[PDB]
């Protein structure tokens, strides 16, 4: 066997896990919702009309352990830009996945400049406006990985640049 060892599992926290958001106030927010007769928590942002958006979400500091390479599985929905009248030039349908490593936990001290970009994350299925109004949810799954980890711990971060995104699952693991 090559068992997976889970380092962080967002959905499994059941809404008890608060992550840091920057700017405080505008940008990402935790919300709750029912999907499949079960309560589901998600981080969300939908500032698609103003177009100078730079909204960051940062995970808690995760202890690396013996992991040298990590796999990050995201599950998310994104709404169709064309579903917003007047949003041609302001609306986007991607977000960015970043990470940073450190030996210590910085707490609320968030320094986006220490973060390196892993990738642009893009949906394979947008949520068109009849899906939205029917409360059906087009889930997308994207996995990435990053190479040899060196410090005691790490953060992951999600930069919104003007998309209407809901992040439902964030799962980080390593393969034994």
């Amino acid at each position, epitope marked *: 066997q090559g068992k997976e060892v889970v380092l962080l599992d967002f959905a499994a926290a059941g809404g008890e896990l608060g992550w840091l958001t920057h700017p405080y106030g505008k940008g990402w927010d935790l*919300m709750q919702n*029912i999907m499949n007769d079960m309560p589901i928590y*998600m981080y*969300s942002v*939908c500032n698609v009309m103003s177009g100078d958006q730079d909204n960051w979400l940062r995970t808690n500091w995760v202890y690396r352990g013996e992991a040298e390479r990590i796999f990050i599985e995201l599950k998310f929905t994104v709404r169709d830009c064309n*579903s917003f009248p007047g949003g041609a030039s302001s609306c986007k349908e991607t977000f960015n996945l970043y990470y940073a490593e450190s030996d210590l936990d910085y707490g609320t001290n968030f320094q986006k400049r220490l973060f390196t970009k892993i990738d642009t994350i893009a949906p394979d299925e947008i949520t068109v406006s009849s899906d*939205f*109004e029917a*409360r059906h949810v087009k889930l997308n799954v994207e996995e990435r990985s990053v190479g040899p980890l060196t410090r005691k711990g790490f953060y992951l971060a999600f930069q919104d640049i003007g998309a209407c995104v809901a992040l439902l699952s964030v799962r980080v693991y390593y393969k034994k």
Partner: antibody
Amino acid sequence: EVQLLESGGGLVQPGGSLRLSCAASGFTFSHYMMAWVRQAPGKGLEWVSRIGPSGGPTHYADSVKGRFTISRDNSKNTLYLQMNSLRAEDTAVYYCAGYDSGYDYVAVAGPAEYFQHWGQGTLVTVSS
Amino acid sequence: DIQMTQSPSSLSASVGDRVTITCRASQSISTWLAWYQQKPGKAPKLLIYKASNLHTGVPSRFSGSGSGTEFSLTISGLQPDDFATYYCQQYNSYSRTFGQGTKVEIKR
């Protein structure tokens, strides 16, 4: 430029009926969810009814159910409320209200909806 | 059903003031709360939805906060035309209940 105009308001005996109308202009009516909200004199606001874009799902407040009917004609851009067996308690300004998902900037829809646009309303006095 | 309860029922403020109105739910409503303004003899108008998102056109001196049970509308630097009645409405359930109202009067 979204405009809603209620009409049909007026005086009616207890037990009587009346049919209200809302004439919409300046938008694509077929895409909006429409509703009626009312306001008894000197009191607060009270949701009455709603209807989906297609004529679709209809819901009523427990205080009105079985007595009122909501409908729409998407080719006349008009919203209707048929009010039967009226009582003094139904006396109120009746407001036409609308919601459209294209101006609701949230990733996932809330379960019920809220009112973006409101007409100026029409008074129904039920009294002998 | 879910009952909504606004506090205070009336309030006295001067222009330039910063005033906060409260809205409480008898059971949880996530962030599905809306705030409305009504001046006398006029239709209401939406101020806030999502329990903190500003409707288009609404001045940024309005702001809302809260979740679950407790919510709040704040007006910083009252203008002459903010004296009005303010209503909240939950849209977590189909009953779509509103609060009774909070009337912002002029202090004298």
